[PDB]
Structures are given as C-alpha cells and as structure tokens.
C-alpha cells in the first residue's frame, strides 16, 4: 500500500510530472 509515495522519492520524486 502507499507504494507510489515511495516509488516517487525513489529518485527524489523526480517524477515531478505534476510539479511541472
């Protein structure tokens, strides 16, 4: 559960898809 939260910080939440 709540894995996405970690999969994000995996690269420093580099997935700033929404942070764009």
Curated annotation (Swiss-Prot):
Coiled-coil regions, chain positions? none
User: Please, which domain of life does this record's source organism belong to?
Assistant: Eukaryota
Reported impact of residue 7 to Q: In GT1 and BDPLT16; uncertain significance; results in low surface expression of the mutant protein
Motif GFFKR motif boundaries: 3-7
What spans does the record annotate as topological domain Cytoplasmic, numbered to this chain? 1-20
What this protein is called in its record is Integrin alpha-IIb light chain, form 2
Species source reads: Homo sapiens
From the broadest rank down, the organism's phylogenetic lineage runs:
Eukaryota, Metazoa, Chordata, Craniata, Vertebrata
Which start and end residues of the full protein are shown?
1020 to 1039 of 1039
